[PDB]
Design a protein around this ligand. Sequence first.
Ligand code: CLA
Ligand code: HEC
Ligand code: HEM
Ligand code: HEM
Ligand SMILES: CC1=C(Br)C(=O)C(C(C)C)=C(Br)C1=O
Ligand code: FES
Ligand code: FES
Lengths: 35, 35, 286, 286, 27, 27, 27, 27, 202, 202, 32, 32, 168, 168, 137, 137
Amino acid sequence: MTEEMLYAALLSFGLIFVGWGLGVLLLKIQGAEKE
Amino acid sequence: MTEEMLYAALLSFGLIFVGWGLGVLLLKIQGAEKE
Amino acid sequence: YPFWAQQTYPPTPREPTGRIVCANCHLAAKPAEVEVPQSVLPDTVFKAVVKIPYDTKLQQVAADGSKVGLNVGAVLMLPEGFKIAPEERIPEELKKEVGDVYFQPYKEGQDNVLLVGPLPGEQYQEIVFPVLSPNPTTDKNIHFGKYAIHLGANRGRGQIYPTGEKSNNNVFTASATGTITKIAKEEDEYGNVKYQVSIQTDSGKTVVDTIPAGPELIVSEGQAVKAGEALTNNPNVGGFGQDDTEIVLQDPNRVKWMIAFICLVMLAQLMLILKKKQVEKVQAAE
Amino acid sequence: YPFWAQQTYPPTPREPTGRIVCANCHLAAKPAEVEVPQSVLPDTVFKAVVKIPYDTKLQQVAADGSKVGLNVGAVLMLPEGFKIAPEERIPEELKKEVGDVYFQPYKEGQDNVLLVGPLPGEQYQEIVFPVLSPNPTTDKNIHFGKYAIHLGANRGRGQIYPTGEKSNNNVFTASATGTITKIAKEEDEYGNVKYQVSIQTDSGKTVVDTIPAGPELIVSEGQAVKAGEALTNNPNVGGFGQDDTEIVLQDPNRVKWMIAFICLVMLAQLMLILKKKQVEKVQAAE
Amino acid sequence: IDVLGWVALLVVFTWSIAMVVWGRNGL
Amino acid sequence: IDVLGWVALLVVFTWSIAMVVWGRNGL
Amino acid sequence: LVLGLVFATLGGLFYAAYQQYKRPNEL
Amino acid sequence: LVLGLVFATLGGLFYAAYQQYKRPNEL
Amino acid sequence: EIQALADDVTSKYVPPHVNIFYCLGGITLTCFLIQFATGFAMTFYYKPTVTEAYASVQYIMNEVSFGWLIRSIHRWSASMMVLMMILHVFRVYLTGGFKKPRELTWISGVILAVITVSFGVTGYSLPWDQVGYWAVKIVSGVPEAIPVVGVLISDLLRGGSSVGQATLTRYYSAHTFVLPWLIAVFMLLHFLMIRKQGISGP
Amino acid sequence: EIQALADDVTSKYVPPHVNIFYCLGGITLTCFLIQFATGFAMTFYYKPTVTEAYASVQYIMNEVSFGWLIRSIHRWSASMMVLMMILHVFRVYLTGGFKKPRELTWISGVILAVITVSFGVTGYSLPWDQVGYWAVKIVSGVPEAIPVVGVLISDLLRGGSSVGQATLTRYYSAHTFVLPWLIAVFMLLHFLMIRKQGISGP
Amino acid sequence: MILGAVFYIVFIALFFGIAVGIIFAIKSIKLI
Amino acid sequence: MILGAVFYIVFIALFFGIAVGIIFAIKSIKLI
Amino acid sequence: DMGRRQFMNLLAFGTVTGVALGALYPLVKYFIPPSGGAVGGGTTAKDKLGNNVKVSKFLESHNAGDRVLVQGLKGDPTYIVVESKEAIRDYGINAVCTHLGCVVPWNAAENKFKCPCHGSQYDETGRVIRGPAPLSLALCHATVQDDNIVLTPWTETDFRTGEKPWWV
Amino acid sequence: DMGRRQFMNLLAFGTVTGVALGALYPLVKYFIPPSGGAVGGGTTAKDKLGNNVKVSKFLESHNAGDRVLVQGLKGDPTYIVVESKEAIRDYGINAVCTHLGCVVPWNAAENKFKCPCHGSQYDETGRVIRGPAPLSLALCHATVQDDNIVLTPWTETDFRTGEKPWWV
Amino acid sequence: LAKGMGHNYYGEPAWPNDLLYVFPVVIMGTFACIVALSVLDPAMVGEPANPFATPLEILPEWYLYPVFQILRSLPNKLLGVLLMASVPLGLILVPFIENVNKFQNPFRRPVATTIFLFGTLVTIWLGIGAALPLDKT
Amino acid sequence: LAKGMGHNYYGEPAWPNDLLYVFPVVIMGTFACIVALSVLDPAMVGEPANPFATPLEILPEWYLYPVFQILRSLPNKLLGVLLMASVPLGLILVPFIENVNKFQNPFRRPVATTIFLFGTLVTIWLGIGAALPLDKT
Ligand code: CLA
Ligand code: HEC
Ligand code: HEM
Ligand code: HEM
Ligand SMILES: CC1=C(Br)C(=O)C(C(C)C)=C(Br)C1=O
Ligand code: FES
Ligand code: FES
């Protein structure tokens, strides 16, 4: 009963950066913080 | 279907004075007014 | 008659709607009352009047017609458990001496369900009902609260028979679109005296009919065309009304408590005024 | 064996609780898996593995004992409507070439309910199940959503027989509170070779019993008191686990819409950021 | 019928505790 | 397995409308 | 017994009202 | 068809979150 | 004892004048909290369904700790608040309360009355009395008229057409779930707004 | 057109700060209004009775323009809010809120959590499942092992002696009537009090 | 059915308690 | 049962999102 | 730079107040009651006992001109007569008093379906003769499906002088 | 004239906060359940069908050492064995697994009431032998009231070496 | 009391508080009755026999008589409906219409009163005990 | 930006409003999922076609594991109970206890953190049930 959801775990958790990045990336375009 | 409740009508309605009086009557005892 | 009901629909006279079989036959149209006390107590004999209007001034026909005496009958649904007071009790004759007739159940057993064989006439128009109240502690099968009470009172001859054919107290119509040229009224030797008729409807097959003794009359010939409809007169005076109601049984230790509760309010809402303004000479001090 | 179940409780093998008859007899204690895709589509042939543990390193006794080959069996509740894929389809042999055995229903008719006559052994430990998905539009008697899938997989000899008496893969106890003074092990000519015993319980009635061939042994006399309990050895390796699950059928025009809805949010929660700060150079103007 | 043979009662009976109570503190 | 062969897709595809839109008013 | 003090209870109870009749200060 | 874009839908959707990343304002 | 304080000091302000009875507003409300209670108090034993209803109410009256009492009250208190309410209207119209300062606390009030009346119609048929039954098997037809704004609407009361398993559940959920929330809301609006008096003079 | 009214104006009365996590609070709440709806939305079709219930839920999934949907959401949204909530706690402890003036918006919050958790336990057994059944036929015993009338309490859950129909109706009325009000209240307290702020940085 | 009079009267107590029986304490506290 | 990881992980994203992975933006925005 | 012409955002929320309707038509559609088929739900005269009522419930259990009604199609309290011609009659009226709703009962006597509540009056086909009821009722088609006594709608010509389909 | 000693009003509200308790003990008493008859209720092994279950439900329908349980007193899932001595056995355990709640089932095999959920283990009188269950169960008294198989409580001495009443 | 701040028009004289420990005098006193009543006169039993029956007893509560009466009262038309729905709506429009009243005895006026002490004489005239060809017995 | 008039203690610096037309951005974005998740993984009915005997599992609410675990976890005693009820109560007493730090939070004084980044390492350690591998991934 581990395997199945077990991948869905770290699964989502990764996507947390996945977007977080972009969120920022969209910034080096319209006036946020430097680098 | 009249008679029965018909007396309960004026019945209560009377009691409205019944007490109202006393309410006042209790006043000629502890300091009320007639302005 | 009352009985008549249980001789066709004996499980109970009260139809699922709210009407009693009485009208599925002997149909009338007069008032009727059945009042009894707000609250009655358990294991108690108490009143139950069944007034029945129409000024005694009234006098209907009869079986043979001869305008004479009038009679009053009925049926009644007392609340489940409620029975007819015990002889012994029935506190003094002050009670006894008003209603002294036969009150029989409907289906064998139902004491709360009562009919009244005895049809006093211009005598017992009150038809009092000495009734005892059950005790729901001697019998846990008996509960309190309000309970329905229904009644269907009759009078005047039947308009319909239990045999399955027209009575007397009612109108006797016909069938003939054409001016009836004559009559046929007469009488009979002994127990009978008929009053036939002869319509016309010359317009083809000259049909006619048979109206019986009983109903008076009106006009005659030269007309009476129309389409061959109603009769000459309607004698019926049958009186059948109907009033429903309800009575309450009260657990005294249940009225006490509610009362014992008042006195608390009675006192509370008092001390609550006692203090307050009745002790505000405080700000009324500066 | 699988069949055995329907030869006693044929209406269905799944007990009201959640267990399958298998244990009400041949009782074991090993793992077991039955995994298949999250969502499967209607009118579709798809996978269904039924892994069955224990390192092939294992080799159990046999009917006569001679330590040899091992065998794997099972039963399975597919969801109502779900049947075994049609030959024609079964997309290429890529499928066919894995599970090539006999899958018969339980009670005559139940296609979602399947047993597996064919017991491959140290061969088919995956026992794949080519399964088609019903169409709930060709049959309105078929509905969507998640649906249960349950399984009870066996192996190793029975411990109990359908005849109604002890098997081999297990232990053979006794009855005697007293030190057994001797034995009775021997053999037989031809199809047989027994291994009796002789307890003692000199403490009154000297009782004893009959253990058969099969199980090995241990200690002997000078003791073996206790209270006359268990036997000398137990061979059983029987393997029976159990895993439940569930799969979803999806109305595509039901996934589309939900998706078609995202893109709206996808856009909405965007324009919603588009304006706002992304257009606030307004107060950021004074 | 009597009824008042009651209101007059119970009722006043609590009244007969009311006017009394001031008599305790005021007096 | 591919999955990203999708996130990379759909995902960015809406991104590819986002950065684009400013280009319209800012530019 | 309480065939009559059945409601005689409720009438000799509007008292509450009666309390709300007494309400005189001077500001 | 969408055996895989089944959830590929949901992952390529945390986007909302992604919007709330462009959060800032000095004022 | 005080702490992270607030107005934890002054609030004893606000002065009125010698005006008898006219509590109808608050009074009306009162009887509510009596119904909210009694009412609720019953959500615990009322088994609302095709039939496990009548046979179930018999259970509250005859056989349970003061059932009759709770019920009865609820029954009276109900048909009672609805009275206290009506008068509350008189007190109003005959004062010029909405006047000008705020006539919405009046209007909202209006709504407050539909809800209230509506509480009955629903609950009033829950015990399925032959009376309670039909008289909501008749008020369920009222809307079968009007340009579908009523026709293909009346259903939103009983289910689809007739009466039985649905007509009830819709009602119940309403009497116990829906309405018991709106009335709340509007009472709040009714009160919240009420920060603007009923009259004035010399 | 704009009308004075009962005043109105910039009700909003104070700036925010500089932070990002903080959000889940409102988020947690969100999912609620999803449950209040979905949830309610079902008071129109759910049959909390012995006989039916399961046979009745089959009815929601079965047909009902989108039952499965409303339900499913409710189910997720539910077990989802309870997640969003827990994090909301982290965001908090991880920072503060449990100190001197909000010396309560936290505590109240606590309660908010019991109610929340409690919503499940009840609703969670309504479906008549075997899982949903027993797992509240087991949590109903939790309170039996107690001194005094601590034992003579567990009943206040199950209604019957063991699990009599009652157990349901008590729960239901709770899940749909009781709790759905407290949580409300406390959320209000939680918010009302919340007329404060935070952030301890540069 | 009692209830009827338990209010067809108590309420009617209101107007003689205001209408043609009271409020005038302002149309009499001041006539000129 | 999926759900488990659909949060036994997403939430655990919080601390590395605060605990031993973030909030320090105040224990670093200022060490002296 | 400048603002002024702040028209555009009618999409800003014109779309937002779009994401709403999207997630709602589904819900509002939800509280909406369906229907599987047409005129036949509990069509087998099912007299409340989930029973596919059979024709032998009306015959010996009944007699000559015996009048007891069953469950009608859709739900209606529809009437089912008996034949003094051994078998039975092929229809049944929508007892649903066309006036208000009071299921009007047959007259054990004169046969004029006098409504109880307001004494309306009918005949052997519903049609009103005495107010307050304005119109007839709707009959059906008796049969023997699986032995049931299945019932159905209307729009045709009859034996003598019938009427005209006043619904649709 | 003067105030100062404002003690008295402890009756003012001491009574008020009295009118409360009065109208409440009733209510609070209310949410408190109902009772049963020491004769009947659901004690007649009523297996959910409101049925006063009779003794012939356990005999031929069963056999020798046949183990199927009925509804127990109060509600409990209480066990009812059968005798290979023709009639039946005079008691039945409170299957209610003393550990948690899992109605532990009998072992068609070795006879040790192994609980399913955590494999507890019992005997022919409940008593635990293997954890996680800490204690026995409670038997009863079979009978023939009106032919029912009525069941009852406990506090006495038995055949061999029983135990001691661990409840009250 | 009065002098110079609230230059609006909402009275704040000199009575304050101490009525909330009489409101309870109200409240309580306003409770008792539903008990006196409930226990003096309990609730009613039900019926449960026929689905399609018809109780000679129909109707709603004294509060849905008029609205009820009307519903029936007039021969068809959404008029029955409308007119009734014109009891709530039609009313909500009062403060808009009968909108003036000033100093003196802003407690009366009549062009409103009359129609009231009338639009309430009809109202009762609708609390009608059935059968009625509209009146006189 | 930080203010000057008002000049208090624990007040409001800057940014104001315009987040409530992003809260909706939150809200909505915080809805969608409960949606999608449903679809991809809807809910269901089950074998309880008219349910009754001790299931093989009983997956108690999908979070109340710890509290559950505990309940069972320890051999009897109201300890099971208490200790669990010590998760709510015991907690309500935190702000009282870890309120030592007159200012800088218990992150400064890890003495709270640790026990947290632990009284939550145990907590997960209680989200633990079924029958899988401990020395196998
Ligand atoms: C001039 C002054 C005057 C005054 C002060 C009053 C004062 C009053 N009238 Mg009245 N009246 C007047 C003139 C006046 N009237 C005139 C001229 C008429 C003649 C037509 C009436 C006719 C009238 C009637 C017929 C009734 C009153 C009633 C009432 C009072 C009770 C209030 C109530 O709750 O209504 C109660 C209102 C209802 C029950 C209506 C509900 C209707 C339901 C079925 C539908 C509502 C539809 C809704 C708007 C739809 C929206 C749906 C949404 C999703 C959009 C009340 C204080 C009512 C009363 O006393 O009832 C017991 C009542 O029934 N009045
Ligand atoms: C009987 C002695 C009275 C009197 C004279 C009043 N009430 Fe009540 N009342 C209740 C509620 C919930 C409100 C709303 C308050 C608001 O909106 O501000 C009121 C309101 C009033 C007002 C208006 C007050 C204001 O400050 O603006 C007035 C003048 C008023 N009431 C008088 C509730 C109740 C009750 C339930 C506990 C009871 C009893 C009463 N009120 C009784 C009275
Ligand atoms: C109800 C149960 C019922 C009552 C009551 C009742 C009474 C009644 C009386 C009191 C008379 C005599 C009147 C007189 O002054 O002569 C009377 C007469 C007849 N009835 Fe009757 N009746 C009740 C019910 C029924 C029913 C159901 C039928 C029909 C089947 C019926 C019929 C008749 C007939 C015929 C007569 C007249 C007898 C005669 O005077 O020759 N009744 N009833
Ligand atoms: C469940 C439906 C069920 C399965 C599956 C099953 C399987 C099974 C296998 C695969 C074997 C052979 C093992 C080997 O390596 O020799 C086997 C053997 C026996 N079984 Fe079985 N079995 C299932 C159910 C049952 C039931 C309900 C009973 C009891 C009535 C039972 C009994 C036995 C016995 C005895 C044997 C051994 C036969 C032999 O090898 O001589 N099984 N089973
Ligand atoms: C006893 C009894 C009472 Br008293 C009652 O009021 C009713 C109806 C009028 C609801 C019915 Br019916 C009934 O049977
Ligand atoms: S409903 Fe039939 S006459 Fe009125
Ligand atoms: S309840 Fe039986 S082992 Fe846990």
